[PDB]
Structure formats: C-alpha cells, structure tokens
Amino acid sequence: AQQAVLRKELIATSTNVIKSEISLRILASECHLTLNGIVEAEAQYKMGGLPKSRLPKIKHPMIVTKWVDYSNKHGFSYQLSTEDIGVLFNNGTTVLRLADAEEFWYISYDDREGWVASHYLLSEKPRELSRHLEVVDFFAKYMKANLHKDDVFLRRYTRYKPFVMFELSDGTFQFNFKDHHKMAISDGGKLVTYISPSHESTTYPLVEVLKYGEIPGYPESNFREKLTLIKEGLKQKSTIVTVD
C-alpha cells in the first residue's frame, strides 16, 4: 500500500472580482468540461488499446506573453499571442487593444447574458471611454519596454502561490508555474501546449504525452506533478457557482 497523501488545499488571492453569477456559472460549467476531457484522456493512457490511431487535431492556441498586476493607479494588465493588450480594470470591465490597433473592444459584464462587448474606433472614440484609454495608454508604454478568426479575451484569473491561472474566452486555460514552466489547455481538454521558460510553443495531444511519462524533450519539467496541480485547479474553480 503506497503511503501518500493529498496535496494541501489551493489558496488563492487577488482574483479579479465579478458580480454576474451566470458568468461564473458558465466558467464553472466550462472548467468542469476541460477537466472531464482530461479524465477521459488519463483513461486513454491507462487502458486504451491503440490510443494513437485516429489522429487528434493540431493547432497552436492563443496564450499570454507578458502580464502584470496593479492595485490602485491602474488595474491588472496583460498581453496575448497576437500582440494584443488587455486591461482588466479594478471594477471588472476590460479594454482590449487589437493586433492591427485601428480599433478596440470594450467589454463589460452583465448578470443576464454574462460578458458583453461593443466595437469602437480610436478615431471615432467617445468621451467617457477616453479616460479609460489613458490607463491603457500607460500599459502600452510599459509593455512596449520589452527588456482572421474570432477574437479572444481574458475572463478570470486567479493568483495561487505555485502558479497563476488564466481562463480565456475561447475555452483555453493557461498556467504560469513557479519554475517558469508554462503550459496551456485547449480544444476542451484534448491538446497540450507546453511553453518552456525559453519562449518556445509546441502543442501535443494529451494521450500522447501521458504514455511518455513526462513533457516531450524537457526532462527537468516534472510533468506528472503539474498535471495534478491543474486538476485540483479546475476542481476548485468549477465549484464557484455563486459569489458567496
């Protein structure tokens, strides 16, 4: 009998706050999906005969390149794999700068339908919004330092100690761990995009990595551990159906 124990509970901090329960309900029902898509994959390695026959899809999902937290003068901010910049204000609203930068989406959150957006141009921009772009204009200057399809944005984040969790609008979950190993789940818990500290993206079917016993190529990853951290990560995030 293997003498082992469950990992300590996942304590979180500085999550972006939201009122729209239904939005939480979607995330909760969405997290559980990619989690069930993984349990279904772990079952493919365990006792799946010829688990690699009918090929699985292959596509590089979106991801977060550089990110920051801020408390007072500005809100949490981030940048994506499309040279896009987002700003999750302290109130909960988001402003997103597109790749080609002629335009920008302004996202709010509502209880009835959930997240809701509206298209504007920087040139045909309104008044009350301009002061929100002053904030973005600074993150643009900061982010600028550096040492189509249906677009995407960040819904919720959660700062745990061992890592930080990103929940995206396209159904893609991302994790920047402590040891700078960064990973991502997309396609409903079927594809794996490990991006080492060396910013190199490569996607893999989950059933292919499970048989291997580790991340492909990189042995210093300690993969079998991080997977466990993802699971309980989604488990906790999937129980949040309400605000209380």
């Binding site: 959930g114 957006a117 509206s118 249906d150 995407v152 819904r155 609008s169 396209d170």
Partner: peptide, 8 residues
C-alpha cells in the same frame, strides 16, 4: 470578426 467567448 465578432469576438468569441462573450455576447455582442
């Protein structure tokens, strides 16, 4: 061009 993962 509509944004996936939210309502317009």
């Amino acid at each position: 061009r509509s944004i996936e993962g939210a309502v317009q």
